[PDB]
């Protein structure tokens, strides 16, 4: 795996973690 | 594919360098010489040697080759580079000389020689080729 797509899946999981942060206060 | 190996070429080389006077362009005659002068274990190799000596005789008869040093053609080079001619082509009555070289010969140890003839200088120094 190259670094670009693991950075992309990091961005996706960080986005969904921020969504669960805003929906789980 | 009929090419000669190194053994037959070296054998023909040494027997054509050491024996030349008792030879000839006829295949059978120098084949019998190859019988007489050299102990050969085979006969096909004998035919190979005799044919190659015949071919090298046809190569010698048009000019010298760079594999042998035969005494009949030897000392022809020595006579040809050992002659002396009458004129040396250097003690001429005319020597053609540039003005800057005249200024050089003015300053060495002479002032003017009686075999000294000058040219005019050139009009343009376009000497180097156009490359870019």
């Amino acid at each position: 795996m190259r670094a670009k797509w693991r950075k992309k899946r990091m961005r996706r999981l960080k986005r969904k973690r921020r969504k669960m942060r805003q929906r789980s206060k | 594919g009929r090419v000669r190996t190194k053994t037959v070429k070296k054998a023909a080389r040494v027997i054509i360098e050491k024996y030349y006077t008792r030879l000839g362009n006829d295949f059978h005659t120098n084949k019998r010489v190859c019988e007489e002068i050299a102990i050969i274990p085979s006969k096909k190799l004998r035919n190979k040697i005799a044919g190659y000596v015949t071919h090298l005789m046809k190569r010698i008869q048009r000019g010298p080759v760079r594999g042998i040093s035969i005494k009949l053609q030897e000392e022809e080079r020595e006579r040809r580079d050992n002659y002396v001619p009458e004129v040396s082509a250097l003690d001429q009555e005319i020597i053609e000389v540039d003005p800057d070289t005249k200024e050089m010969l003015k300053l060495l140890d002479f002032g003017s020689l009686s075999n000294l003839q000058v040219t005019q200088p050139t009009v343009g120094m376009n000497f180097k080729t156009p490359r870019g």
């Binding site: - | 040809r80 580079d81 050992n82 002659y83 002396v84 001619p85 040396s88 082509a89 250097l90 003690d91 001429q92 020597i95 000389v97 540039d98 800057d100 070289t101 050089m104 010969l105 060495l108 140890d109 002479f110 075999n115 200088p121 050139t122 120094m125 000497f127 180097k128």
Partner: protein, 217 residues
């Protein structure tokens, strides 16, 4: 080298220099050759000194007569321009000639039959014969060279500036070099003209060989 009032040119050596065209050089220069060259004239040909080259022939002659064994001077020419004058020089002075295809094992390979290691190494062109100098580097061997203005100066000890392109200039200066060697040796006189011919050192194309054969007897 010129310290005496006998060891100069009288009238004729500069005449032979003018006849052979030894004063004409190449267009490009070297960074070590500005002191051996007078100036630069028109049409891009460097004009060289003659006193300096005379001093270089005197120094090289002193180096040759310095050793006592005449067989310990190896003189090498691979180019065809001066390959015969090397043989005549070795015939006149007893030197060891190499003419054409200097094999890379004469100085450093011991098991070969052609194993030579003399006092003196004399060569005709450092530009063309870049090969024997690098092999003679590994033995304590000095180098006498016949240098042009475009020739690189490397593993050199005495650089004689000359015109090593025309065969007449080269054969003339080998004839003068042999003349100085026999003068300091004492075989020939210093004032009596011993000149057998200078034509014995000149090389020429085989077309002119055939032309001279048909023109002469």
């Amino acid at each position: 080298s010129g310290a005496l009032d006998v060891l100069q040119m009288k009238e004729e050596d500069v005449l032979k220099f003018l006849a052979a065209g030894t004063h004409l050089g190449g267009t490009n220069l070297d960074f070590q050759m500005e002191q051996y060259i007078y100036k630069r004239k028109s049409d891009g040909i460097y004009i060289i000194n003659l006193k300096r080259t005379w001093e270089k022939l005197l120094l090289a002659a002193r180096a040759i007569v310095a050793i006592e064994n005449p067989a310990d001077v190896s003189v090498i020419s691979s180019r065809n321009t001066g390959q015969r004058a090397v043989l005549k020089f070795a015939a006149a002075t007893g030197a060891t000639p190499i003419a054409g295809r200097f094999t890379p094992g004469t100085f450093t390979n011991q098991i070969q039959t052609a194993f030579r290691e003399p006092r003196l190494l004399v060569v005709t062109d450092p530009r063309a014969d870049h090969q024997p100098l690098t092999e003679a580097s590994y033995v304590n061997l000095p180098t006498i060279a016949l240098c042009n203005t475009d020739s690189p100066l490397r593993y050199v000890d005495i650089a004689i500036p000359c015109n090593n392109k025309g065969a007449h200039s080269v054969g003339l200066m080998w004839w003068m070099l042999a003349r100085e060697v026999l003068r300091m040796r004492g075989t020939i006189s210093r004032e009596h003209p011993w000149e057998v011919m200078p034509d014995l050192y000149f090389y020429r194309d085989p077309e002119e060989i055939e032309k001279e054969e048909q023109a002469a007897a």
